[PDB]
PDB file of C-alpha atoms in Angstrom:
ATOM      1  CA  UNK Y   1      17.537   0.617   2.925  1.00 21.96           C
ATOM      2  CA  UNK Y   2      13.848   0.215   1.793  1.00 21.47           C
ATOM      3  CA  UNK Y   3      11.428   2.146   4.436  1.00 20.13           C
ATOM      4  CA  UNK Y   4       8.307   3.098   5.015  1.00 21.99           C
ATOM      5  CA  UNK Y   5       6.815   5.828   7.247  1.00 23.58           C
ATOM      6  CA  UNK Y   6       3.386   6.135   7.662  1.00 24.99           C
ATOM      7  CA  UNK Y   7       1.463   9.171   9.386  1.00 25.66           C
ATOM      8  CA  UNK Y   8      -1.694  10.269   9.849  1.00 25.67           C
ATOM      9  CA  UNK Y   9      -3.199   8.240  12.532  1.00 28.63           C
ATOM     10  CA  UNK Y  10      -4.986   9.932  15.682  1.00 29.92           C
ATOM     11  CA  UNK Y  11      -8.431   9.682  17.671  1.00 28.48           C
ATOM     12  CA  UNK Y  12     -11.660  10.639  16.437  1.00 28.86           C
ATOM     13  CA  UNK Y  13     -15.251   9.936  17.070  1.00 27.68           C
ATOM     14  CA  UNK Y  14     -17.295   7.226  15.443  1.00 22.77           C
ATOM     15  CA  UNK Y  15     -18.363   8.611  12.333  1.00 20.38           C
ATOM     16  CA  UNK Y  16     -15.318  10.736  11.865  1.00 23.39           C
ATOM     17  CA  UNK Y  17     -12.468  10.975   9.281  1.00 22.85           C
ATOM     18  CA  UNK Y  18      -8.735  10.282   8.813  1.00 23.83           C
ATOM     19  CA  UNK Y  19      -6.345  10.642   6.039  1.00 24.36           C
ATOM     20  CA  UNK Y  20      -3.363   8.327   6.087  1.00 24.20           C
ATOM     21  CA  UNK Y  21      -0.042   8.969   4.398  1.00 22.73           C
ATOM     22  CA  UNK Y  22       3.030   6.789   3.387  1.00 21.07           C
ATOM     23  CA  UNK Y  23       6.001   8.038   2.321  1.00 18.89           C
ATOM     24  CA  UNK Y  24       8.629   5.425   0.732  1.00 17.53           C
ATOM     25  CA  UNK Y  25      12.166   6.112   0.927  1.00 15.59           C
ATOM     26  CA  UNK Y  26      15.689   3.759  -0.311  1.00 12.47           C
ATOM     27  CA  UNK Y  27      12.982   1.692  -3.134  1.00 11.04           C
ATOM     28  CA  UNK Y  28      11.848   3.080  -6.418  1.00 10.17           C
ATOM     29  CA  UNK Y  29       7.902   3.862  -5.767  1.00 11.79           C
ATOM     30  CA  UNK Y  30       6.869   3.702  -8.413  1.00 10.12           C
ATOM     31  CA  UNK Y  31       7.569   0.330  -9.662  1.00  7.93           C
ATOM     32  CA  UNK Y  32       6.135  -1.645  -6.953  1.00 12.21           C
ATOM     33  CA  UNK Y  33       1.812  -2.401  -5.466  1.00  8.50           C
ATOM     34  CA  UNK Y  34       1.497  -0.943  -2.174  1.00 14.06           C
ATOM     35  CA  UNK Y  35      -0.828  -1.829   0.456  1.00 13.04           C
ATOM     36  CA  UNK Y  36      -2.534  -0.833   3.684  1.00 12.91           C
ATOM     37  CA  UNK Y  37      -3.068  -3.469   6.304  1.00 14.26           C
ATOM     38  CA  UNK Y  38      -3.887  -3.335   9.934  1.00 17.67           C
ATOM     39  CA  UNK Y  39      -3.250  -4.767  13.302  1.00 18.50           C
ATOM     40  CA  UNK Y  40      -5.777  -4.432  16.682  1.00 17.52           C
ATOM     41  CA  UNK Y  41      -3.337  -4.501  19.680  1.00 17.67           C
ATOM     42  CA  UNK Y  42      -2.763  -7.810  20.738  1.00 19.78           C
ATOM     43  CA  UNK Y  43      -4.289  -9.465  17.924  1.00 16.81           C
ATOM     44  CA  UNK Y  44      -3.682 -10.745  14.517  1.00 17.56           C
ATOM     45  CA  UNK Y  45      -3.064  -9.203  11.050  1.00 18.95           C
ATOM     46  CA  UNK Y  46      -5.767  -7.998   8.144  1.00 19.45           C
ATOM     47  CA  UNK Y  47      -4.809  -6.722   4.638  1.00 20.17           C
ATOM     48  CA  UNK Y  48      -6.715  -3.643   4.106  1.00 20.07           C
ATOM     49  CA  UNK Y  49      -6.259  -2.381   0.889  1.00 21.50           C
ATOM     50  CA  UNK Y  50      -4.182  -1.650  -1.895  1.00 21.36           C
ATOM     51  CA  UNK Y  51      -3.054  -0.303  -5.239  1.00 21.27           C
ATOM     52  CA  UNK Y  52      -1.295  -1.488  -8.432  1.00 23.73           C
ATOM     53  CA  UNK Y  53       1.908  -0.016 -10.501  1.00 23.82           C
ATOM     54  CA  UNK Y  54       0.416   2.999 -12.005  1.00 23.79           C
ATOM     55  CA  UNK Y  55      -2.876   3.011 -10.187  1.00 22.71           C
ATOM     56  CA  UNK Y  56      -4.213   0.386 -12.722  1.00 22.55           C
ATOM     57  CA  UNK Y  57      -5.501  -2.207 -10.302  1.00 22.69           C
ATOM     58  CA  UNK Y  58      -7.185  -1.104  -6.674  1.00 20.41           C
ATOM     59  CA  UNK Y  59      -9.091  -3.017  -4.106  1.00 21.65           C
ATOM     60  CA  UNK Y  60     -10.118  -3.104  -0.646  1.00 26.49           C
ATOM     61  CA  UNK Y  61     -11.286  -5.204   2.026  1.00 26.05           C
ATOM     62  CA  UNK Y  62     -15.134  -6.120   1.939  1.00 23.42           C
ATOM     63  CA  UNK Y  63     -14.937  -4.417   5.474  1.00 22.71           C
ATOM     64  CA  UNK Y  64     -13.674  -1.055   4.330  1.00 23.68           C
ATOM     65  CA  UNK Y  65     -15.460  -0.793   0.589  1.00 26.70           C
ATOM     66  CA  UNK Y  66     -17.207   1.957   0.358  1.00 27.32           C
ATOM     67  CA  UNK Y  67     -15.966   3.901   3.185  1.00 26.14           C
ATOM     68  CA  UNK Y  68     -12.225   3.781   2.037  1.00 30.01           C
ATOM     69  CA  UNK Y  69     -10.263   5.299  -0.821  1.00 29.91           C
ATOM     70  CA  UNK Y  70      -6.644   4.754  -2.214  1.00 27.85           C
ATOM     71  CA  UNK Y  71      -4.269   6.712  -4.258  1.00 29.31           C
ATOM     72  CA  UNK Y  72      -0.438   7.242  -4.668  1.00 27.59           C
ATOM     73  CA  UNK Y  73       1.099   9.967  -6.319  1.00 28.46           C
ATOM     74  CA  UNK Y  74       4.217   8.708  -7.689  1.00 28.82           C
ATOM     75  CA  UNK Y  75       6.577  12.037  -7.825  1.00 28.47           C
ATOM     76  CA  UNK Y  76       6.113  12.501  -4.124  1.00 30.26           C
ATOM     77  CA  UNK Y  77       6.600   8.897  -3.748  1.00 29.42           C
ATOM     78  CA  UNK Y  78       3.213   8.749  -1.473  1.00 29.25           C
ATOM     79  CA  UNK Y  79       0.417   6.392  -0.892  1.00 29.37           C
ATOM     80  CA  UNK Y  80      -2.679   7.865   1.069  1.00 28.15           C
ATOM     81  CA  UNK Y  81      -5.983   6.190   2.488  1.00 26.54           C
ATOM     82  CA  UNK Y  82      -8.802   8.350   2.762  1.00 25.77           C
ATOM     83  CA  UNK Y  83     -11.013   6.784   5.629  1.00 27.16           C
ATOM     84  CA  UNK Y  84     -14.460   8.106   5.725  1.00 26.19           C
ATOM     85  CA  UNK Y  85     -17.286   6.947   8.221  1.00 27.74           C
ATOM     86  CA  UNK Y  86     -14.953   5.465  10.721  1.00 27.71           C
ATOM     87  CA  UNK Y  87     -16.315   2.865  13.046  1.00 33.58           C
ATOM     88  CA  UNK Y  88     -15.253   1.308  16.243  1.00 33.80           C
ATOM     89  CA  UNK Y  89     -13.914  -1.777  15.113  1.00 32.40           C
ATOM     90  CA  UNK Y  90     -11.558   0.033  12.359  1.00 33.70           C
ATOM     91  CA  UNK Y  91      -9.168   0.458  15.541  1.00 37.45           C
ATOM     92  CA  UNK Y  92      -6.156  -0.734  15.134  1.00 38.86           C
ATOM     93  CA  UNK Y  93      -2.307   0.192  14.036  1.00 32.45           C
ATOM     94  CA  UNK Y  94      -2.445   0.648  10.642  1.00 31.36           C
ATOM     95  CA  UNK Y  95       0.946  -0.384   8.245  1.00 32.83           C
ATOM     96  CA  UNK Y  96       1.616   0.538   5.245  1.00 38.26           C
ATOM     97  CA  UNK Y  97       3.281  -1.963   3.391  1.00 37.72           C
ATOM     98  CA  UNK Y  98       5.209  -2.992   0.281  1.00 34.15           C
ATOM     99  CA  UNK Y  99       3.355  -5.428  -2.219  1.00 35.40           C
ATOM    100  CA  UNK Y 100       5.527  -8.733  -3.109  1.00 35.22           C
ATOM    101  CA  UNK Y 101       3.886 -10.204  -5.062  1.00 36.22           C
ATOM    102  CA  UNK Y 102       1.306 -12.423  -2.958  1.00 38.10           C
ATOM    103  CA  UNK Y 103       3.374 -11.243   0.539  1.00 37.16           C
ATOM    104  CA  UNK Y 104       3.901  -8.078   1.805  1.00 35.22           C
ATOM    105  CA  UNK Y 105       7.563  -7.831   1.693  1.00 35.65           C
ATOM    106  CA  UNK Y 106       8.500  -4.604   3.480  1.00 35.91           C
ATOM    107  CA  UNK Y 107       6.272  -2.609   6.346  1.00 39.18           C
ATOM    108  CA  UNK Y 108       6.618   0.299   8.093  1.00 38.71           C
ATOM    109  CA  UNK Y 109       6.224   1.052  11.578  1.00 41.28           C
ATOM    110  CA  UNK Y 110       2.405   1.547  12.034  1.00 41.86           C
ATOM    111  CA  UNK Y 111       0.593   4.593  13.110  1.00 43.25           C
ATOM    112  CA  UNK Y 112      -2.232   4.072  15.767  1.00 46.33           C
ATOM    113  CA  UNK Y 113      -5.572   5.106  14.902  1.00 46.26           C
ATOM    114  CA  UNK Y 114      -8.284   5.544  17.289  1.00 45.95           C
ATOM    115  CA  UNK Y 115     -12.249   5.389  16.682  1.00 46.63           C
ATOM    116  CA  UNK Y 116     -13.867   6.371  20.087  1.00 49.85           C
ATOM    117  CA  UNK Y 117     -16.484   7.802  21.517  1.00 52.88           C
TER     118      UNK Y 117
ATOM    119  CA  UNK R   1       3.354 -19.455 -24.362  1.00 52.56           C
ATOM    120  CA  UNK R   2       2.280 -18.470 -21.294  1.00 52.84           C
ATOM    121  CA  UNK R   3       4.395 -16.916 -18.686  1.00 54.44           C
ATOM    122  CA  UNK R   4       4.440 -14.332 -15.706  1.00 53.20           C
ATOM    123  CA  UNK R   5       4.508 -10.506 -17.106  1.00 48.44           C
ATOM    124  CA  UNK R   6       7.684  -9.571 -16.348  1.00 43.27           C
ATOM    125  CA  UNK R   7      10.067  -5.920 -15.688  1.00 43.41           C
ATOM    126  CA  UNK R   8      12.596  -6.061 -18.693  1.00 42.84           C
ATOM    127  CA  UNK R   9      14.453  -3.693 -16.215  1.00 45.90           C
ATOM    128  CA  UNK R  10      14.065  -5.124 -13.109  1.00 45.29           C
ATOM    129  CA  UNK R  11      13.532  -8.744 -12.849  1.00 46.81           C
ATOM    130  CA  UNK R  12      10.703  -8.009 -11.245  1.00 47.69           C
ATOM    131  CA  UNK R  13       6.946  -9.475 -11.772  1.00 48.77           C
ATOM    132  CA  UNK R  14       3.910  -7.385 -12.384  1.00 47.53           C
ATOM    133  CA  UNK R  15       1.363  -7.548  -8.701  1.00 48.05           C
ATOM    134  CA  UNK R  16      -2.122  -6.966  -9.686  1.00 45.54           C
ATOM    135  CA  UNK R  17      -4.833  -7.247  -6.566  1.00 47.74           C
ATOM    136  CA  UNK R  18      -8.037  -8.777  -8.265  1.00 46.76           C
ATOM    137  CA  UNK R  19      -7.406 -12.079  -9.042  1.00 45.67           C
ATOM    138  CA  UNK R  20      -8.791 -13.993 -12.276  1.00 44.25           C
ATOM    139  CA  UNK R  21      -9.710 -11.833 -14.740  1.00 41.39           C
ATOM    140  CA  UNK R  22      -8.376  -8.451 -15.137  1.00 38.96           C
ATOM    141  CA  UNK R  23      -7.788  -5.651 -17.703  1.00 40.37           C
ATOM    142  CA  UNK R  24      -4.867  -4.531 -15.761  1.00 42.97           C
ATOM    143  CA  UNK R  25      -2.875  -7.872 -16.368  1.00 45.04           C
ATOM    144  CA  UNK R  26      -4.336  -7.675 -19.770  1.00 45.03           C
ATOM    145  CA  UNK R  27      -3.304  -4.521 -20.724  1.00 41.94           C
ATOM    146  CA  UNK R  28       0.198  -4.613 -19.252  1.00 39.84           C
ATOM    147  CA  UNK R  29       0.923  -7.620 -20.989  1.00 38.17           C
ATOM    148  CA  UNK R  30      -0.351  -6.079 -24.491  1.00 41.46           C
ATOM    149  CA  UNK R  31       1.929  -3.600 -23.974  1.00 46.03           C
ATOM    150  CA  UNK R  32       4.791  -5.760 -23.883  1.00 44.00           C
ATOM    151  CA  UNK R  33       3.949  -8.751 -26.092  1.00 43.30           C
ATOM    152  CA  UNK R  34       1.703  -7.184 -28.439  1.00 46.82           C
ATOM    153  CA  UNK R  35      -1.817  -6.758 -29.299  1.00 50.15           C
ATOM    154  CA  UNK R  36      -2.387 -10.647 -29.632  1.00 49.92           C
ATOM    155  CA  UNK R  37      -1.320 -11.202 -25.873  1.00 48.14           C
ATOM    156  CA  UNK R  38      -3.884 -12.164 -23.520  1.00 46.31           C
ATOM    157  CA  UNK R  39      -3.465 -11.890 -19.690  1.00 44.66           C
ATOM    158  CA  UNK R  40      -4.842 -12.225 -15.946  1.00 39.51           C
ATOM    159  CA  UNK R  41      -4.288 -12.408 -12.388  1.00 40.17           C
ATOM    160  CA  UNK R  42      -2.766 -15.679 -10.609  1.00 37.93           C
ATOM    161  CA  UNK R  43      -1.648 -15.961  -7.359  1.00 39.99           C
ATOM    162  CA  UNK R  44      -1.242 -11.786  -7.284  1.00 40.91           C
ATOM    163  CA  UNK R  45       0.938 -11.630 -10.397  1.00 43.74           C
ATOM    164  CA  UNK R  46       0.388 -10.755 -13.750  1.00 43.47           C
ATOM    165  CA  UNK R  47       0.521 -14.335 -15.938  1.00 41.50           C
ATOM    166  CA  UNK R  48       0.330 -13.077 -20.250  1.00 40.07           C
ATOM    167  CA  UNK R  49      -1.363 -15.727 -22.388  1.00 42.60           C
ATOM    168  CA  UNK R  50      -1.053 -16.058 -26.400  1.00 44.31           C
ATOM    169  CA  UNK R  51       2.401 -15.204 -26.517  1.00 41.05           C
ATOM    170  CA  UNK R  52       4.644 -16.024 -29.737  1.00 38.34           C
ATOM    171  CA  UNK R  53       6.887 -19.005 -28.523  1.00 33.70           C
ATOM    172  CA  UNK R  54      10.513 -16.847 -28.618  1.00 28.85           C
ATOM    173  CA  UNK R  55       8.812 -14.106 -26.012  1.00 28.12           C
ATOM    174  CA  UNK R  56      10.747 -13.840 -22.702  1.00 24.21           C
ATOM    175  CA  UNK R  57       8.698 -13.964 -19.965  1.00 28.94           C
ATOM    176  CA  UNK R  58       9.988 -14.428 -16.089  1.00 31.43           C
ATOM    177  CA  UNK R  59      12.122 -15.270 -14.806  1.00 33.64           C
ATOM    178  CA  UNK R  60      15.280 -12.816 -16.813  1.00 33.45           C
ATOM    179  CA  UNK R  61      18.313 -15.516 -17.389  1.00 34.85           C
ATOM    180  CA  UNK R  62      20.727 -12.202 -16.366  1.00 41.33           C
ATOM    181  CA  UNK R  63      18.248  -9.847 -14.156  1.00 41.85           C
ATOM    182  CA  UNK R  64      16.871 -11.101 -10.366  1.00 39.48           C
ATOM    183  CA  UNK R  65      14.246  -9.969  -8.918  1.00 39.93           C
TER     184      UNK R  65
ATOM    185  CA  UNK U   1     -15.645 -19.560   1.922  1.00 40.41           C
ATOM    186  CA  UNK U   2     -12.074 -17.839   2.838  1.00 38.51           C
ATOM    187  CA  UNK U   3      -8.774 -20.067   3.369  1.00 37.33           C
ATOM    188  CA  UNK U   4      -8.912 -20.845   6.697  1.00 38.07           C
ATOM    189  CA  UNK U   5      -5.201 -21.216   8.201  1.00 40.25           C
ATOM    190  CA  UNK U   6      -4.209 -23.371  11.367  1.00 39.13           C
ATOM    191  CA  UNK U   7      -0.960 -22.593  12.998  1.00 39.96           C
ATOM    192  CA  UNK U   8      -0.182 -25.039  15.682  1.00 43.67           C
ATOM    193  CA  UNK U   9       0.983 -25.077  18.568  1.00 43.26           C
ATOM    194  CA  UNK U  10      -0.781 -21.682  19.561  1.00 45.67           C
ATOM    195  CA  UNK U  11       2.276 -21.380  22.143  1.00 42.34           C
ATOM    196  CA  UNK U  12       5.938 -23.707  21.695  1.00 42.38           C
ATOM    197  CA  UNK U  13       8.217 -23.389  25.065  1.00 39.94           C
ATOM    198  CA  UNK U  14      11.904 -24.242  23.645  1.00 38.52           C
ATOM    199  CA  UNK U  15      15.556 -23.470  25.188  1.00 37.83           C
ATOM    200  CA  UNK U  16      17.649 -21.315  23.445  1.00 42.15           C
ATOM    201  CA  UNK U  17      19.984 -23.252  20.896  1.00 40.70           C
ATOM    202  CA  UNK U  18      17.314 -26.237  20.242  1.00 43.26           C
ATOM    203  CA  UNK U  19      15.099 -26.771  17.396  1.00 42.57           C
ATOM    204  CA  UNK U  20      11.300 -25.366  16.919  1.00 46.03           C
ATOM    205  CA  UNK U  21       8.912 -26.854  14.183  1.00 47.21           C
ATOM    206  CA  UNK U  22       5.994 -24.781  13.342  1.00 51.52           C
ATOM    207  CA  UNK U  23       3.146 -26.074  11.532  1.00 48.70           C
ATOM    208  CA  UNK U  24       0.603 -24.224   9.143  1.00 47.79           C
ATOM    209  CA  UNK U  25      -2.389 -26.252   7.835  1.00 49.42           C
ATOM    210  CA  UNK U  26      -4.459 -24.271   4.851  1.00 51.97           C
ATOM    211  CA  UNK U  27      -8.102 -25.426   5.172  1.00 52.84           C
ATOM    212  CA  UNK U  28      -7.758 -26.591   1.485  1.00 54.90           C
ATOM    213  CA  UNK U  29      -4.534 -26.032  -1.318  1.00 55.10           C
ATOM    214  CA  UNK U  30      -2.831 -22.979  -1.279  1.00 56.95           C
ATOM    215  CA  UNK U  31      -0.027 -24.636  -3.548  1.00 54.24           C
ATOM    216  CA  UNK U  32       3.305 -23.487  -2.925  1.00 54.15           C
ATOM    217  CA  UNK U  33       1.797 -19.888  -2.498  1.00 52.75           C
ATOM    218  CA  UNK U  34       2.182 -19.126   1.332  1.00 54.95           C
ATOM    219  CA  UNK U  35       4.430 -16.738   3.017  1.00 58.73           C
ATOM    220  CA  UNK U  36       5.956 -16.674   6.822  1.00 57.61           C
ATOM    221  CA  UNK U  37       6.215 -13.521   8.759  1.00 58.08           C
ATOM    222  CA  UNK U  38       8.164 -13.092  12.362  1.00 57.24           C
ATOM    223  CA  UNK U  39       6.692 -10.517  14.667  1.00 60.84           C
ATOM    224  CA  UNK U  40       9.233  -9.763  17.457  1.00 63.20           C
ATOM    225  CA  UNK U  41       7.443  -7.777  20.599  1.00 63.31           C
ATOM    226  CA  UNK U  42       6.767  -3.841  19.943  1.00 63.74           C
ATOM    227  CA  UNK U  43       7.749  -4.005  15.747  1.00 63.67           C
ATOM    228  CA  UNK U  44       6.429  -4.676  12.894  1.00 62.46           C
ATOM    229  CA  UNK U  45       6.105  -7.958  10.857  1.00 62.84           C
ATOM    230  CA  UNK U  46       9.440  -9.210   9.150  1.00 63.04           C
ATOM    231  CA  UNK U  47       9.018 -11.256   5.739  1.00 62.10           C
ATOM    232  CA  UNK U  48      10.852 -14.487   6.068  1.00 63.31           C
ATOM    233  CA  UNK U  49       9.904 -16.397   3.114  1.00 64.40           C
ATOM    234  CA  UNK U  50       7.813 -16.352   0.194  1.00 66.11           C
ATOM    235  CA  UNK U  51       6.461 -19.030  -1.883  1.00 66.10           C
ATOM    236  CA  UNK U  52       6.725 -21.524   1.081  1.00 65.63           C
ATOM    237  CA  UNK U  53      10.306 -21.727   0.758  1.00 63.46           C
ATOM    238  CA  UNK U  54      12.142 -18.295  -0.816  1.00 61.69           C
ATOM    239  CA  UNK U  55      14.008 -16.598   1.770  1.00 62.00           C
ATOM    240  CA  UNK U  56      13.518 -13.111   1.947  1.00 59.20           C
ATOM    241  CA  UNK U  57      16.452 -11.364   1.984  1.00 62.01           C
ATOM    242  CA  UNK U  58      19.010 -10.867   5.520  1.00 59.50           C
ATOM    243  CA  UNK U  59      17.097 -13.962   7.311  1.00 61.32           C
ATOM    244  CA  UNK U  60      19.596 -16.241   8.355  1.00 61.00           C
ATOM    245  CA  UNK U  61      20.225 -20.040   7.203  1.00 60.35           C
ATOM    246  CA  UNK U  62      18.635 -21.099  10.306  1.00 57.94           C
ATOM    247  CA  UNK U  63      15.370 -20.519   9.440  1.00 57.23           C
ATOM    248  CA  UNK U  64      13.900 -22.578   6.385  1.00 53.75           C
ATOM    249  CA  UNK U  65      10.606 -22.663   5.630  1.00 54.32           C
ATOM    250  CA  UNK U  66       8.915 -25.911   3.271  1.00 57.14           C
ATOM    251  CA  UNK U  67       5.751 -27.791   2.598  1.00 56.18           C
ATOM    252  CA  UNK U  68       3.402 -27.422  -0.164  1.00 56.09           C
ATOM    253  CA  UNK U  69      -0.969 -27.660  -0.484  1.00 52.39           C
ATOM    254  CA  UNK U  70      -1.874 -27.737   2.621  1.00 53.22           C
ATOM    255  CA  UNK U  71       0.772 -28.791   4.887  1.00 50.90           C
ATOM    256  CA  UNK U  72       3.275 -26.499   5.460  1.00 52.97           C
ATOM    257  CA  UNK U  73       6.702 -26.036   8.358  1.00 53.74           C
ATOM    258  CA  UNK U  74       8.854 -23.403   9.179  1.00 53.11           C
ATOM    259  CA  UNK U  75      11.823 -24.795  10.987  1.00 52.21           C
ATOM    260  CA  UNK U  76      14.225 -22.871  12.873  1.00 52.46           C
ATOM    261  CA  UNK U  77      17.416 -24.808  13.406  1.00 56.91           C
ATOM    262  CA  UNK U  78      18.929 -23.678  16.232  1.00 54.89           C
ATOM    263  CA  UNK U  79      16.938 -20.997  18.589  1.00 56.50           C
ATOM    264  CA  UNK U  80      19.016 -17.229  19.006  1.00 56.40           C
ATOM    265  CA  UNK U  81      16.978 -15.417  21.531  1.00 51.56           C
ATOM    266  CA  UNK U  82      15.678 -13.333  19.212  1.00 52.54           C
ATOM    267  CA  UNK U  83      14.073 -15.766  17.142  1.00 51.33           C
ATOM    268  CA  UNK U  84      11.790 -15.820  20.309  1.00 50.68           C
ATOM    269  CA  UNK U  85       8.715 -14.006  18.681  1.00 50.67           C
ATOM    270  CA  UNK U  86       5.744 -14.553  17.357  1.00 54.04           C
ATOM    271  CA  UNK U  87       5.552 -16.389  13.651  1.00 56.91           C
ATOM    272  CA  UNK U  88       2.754 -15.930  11.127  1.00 58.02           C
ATOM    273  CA  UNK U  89       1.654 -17.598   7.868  1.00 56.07           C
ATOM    274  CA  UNK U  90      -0.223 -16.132   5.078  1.00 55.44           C
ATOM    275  CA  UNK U  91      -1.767 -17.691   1.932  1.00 56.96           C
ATOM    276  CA  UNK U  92      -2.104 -15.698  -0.973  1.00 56.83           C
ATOM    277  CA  UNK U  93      -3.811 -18.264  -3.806  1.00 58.48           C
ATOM    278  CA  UNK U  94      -7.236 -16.948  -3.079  1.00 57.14           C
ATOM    279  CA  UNK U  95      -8.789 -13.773  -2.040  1.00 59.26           C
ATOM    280  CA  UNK U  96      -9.398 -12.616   0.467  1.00 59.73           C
ATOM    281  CA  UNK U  97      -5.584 -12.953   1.581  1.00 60.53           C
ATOM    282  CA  UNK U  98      -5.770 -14.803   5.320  1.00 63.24           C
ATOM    283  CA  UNK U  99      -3.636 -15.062   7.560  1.00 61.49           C
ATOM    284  CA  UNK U 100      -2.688 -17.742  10.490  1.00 62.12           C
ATOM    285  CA  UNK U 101      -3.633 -16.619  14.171  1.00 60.58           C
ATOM    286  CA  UNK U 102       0.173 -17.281  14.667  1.00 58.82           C
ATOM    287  CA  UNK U 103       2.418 -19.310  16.838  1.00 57.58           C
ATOM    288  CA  UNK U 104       4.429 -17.566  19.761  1.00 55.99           C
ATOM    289  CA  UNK U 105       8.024 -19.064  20.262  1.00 57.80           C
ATOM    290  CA  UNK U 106       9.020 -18.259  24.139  1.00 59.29           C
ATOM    291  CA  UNK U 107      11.667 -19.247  26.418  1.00 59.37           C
ATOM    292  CA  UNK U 108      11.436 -22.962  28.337  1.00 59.29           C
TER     293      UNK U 108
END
């Protein structure tokens, strides 16, 4: 079955840095967008950013431009977000998720990241 | 013709992320109709302009998505 | 101005077996391109259709999803307790994507 795992996540200061990873598994990578959203606990949902087939299109969230990069490397079947300058309100669980065209179609199971003083 | 890029293989569309104009779309659908194709983003998928009138475009008669 | 999305009711209280009606209203037309998501307590969001109306696939006949513009329903026939969760929509004509601030189904 198509899954997702992402990993990654943690605690770090305002300021601080994370790399997230997603590894796809029971899909072929390569032929599909994939995208990073994000959840605060007990709220609602925010697409984050994301990345064409073949790394030809890439965008991000007004929020996170600037601060955030995406890539995938296709023989590892991986997408990674490199998060720079983390700030409080980037908390949240962060999916990655499987582009459908408009909807995300397929998400993983989150991994929690933590900006804190 | 105008139609949504689509996988030959697969069924599937072609997602692009910045809507309207876009030299992703563009390209891809160049590469599949020829060098007279135009093409941009709508609705998140890749939709190929200028195509001659026999081209296949989505959805596949045989292939789903 | 982003696509503003209004899921009512915030909260519907129905038994097990009955019928629930949610509603999404797009601040202006998203045409037929709107998708519904089911968020069951402690996972992750579930695609249940696409396009206002595609089912994604495994989701069971019960659940049908319709509408078009601005006015859009996702009807679940007959409640199995597990439908009890909480159901979001999404409109994907314009960017930024937005999504609905959702509508929890629970118990009566």
């Amino acid at each position: 079955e198509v899954q997702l795992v992402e990993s990654g996540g943690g605690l770090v200061q305002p300021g601080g840095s994370l790399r997230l990873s997603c590894t796809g598994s029971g899909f072929t990578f390569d032929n599909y967008a994939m995208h990073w959203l994000r959840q605060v606990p007990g709220e609602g949902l925010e697409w984050v950013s994301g990345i064409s087939r073949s790394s030809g299109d890439i965008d991000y969230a007004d929020s996170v431009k600037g601060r955030f990069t995406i890539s995938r490397d296709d023989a590892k079947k991986t997408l990674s977000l490199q998060m720079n300058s983390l700030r409080a309100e980037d908390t949240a669980v962060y999916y990655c998720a499987r582009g459908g065209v408009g909807s995300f179609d397929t998400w993983g199971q989150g991994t929690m990241v933590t900006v804190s003083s | 013709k105008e139609g949504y890029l689509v996988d030959k293989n697969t069924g599937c569309k072609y997602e692009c992320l910045k809507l309207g104009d876009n030299d992703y779309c563009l390209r891809e659908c160049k590469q599949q109709y020829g060098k007279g194709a135009g093409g941009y983003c709508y609705a998140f998928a890749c939709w190929c302009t200028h195509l001659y009138e026999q081209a296949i475009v989505w959805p596949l008669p045989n292939k789903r998505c | 101005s982003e696509i503003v999305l209004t899921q009512s009711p915030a909260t519907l209280s129905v038994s097990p077996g009955e019928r629930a009606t949610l509603s999404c209203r797009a601040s202006q037309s998203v045409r037929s391109y709107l998708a519904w998501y089911q968020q069951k307590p402690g996972q992750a969001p579930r695609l249940l259709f696409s396009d206002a109306s595609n089912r994604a696939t495994g989701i069971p006949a019960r659940f049908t999803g319709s509408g078009s513009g601005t006015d859009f329903t996702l009807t679940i026939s007959s409640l199995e307790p597990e439908d009890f969760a909480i159901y979001y929509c999404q409109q994907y004509r314009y960017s930024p994507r937005t999504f609905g601030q959702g509508t929890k189904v629970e118990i009566k």
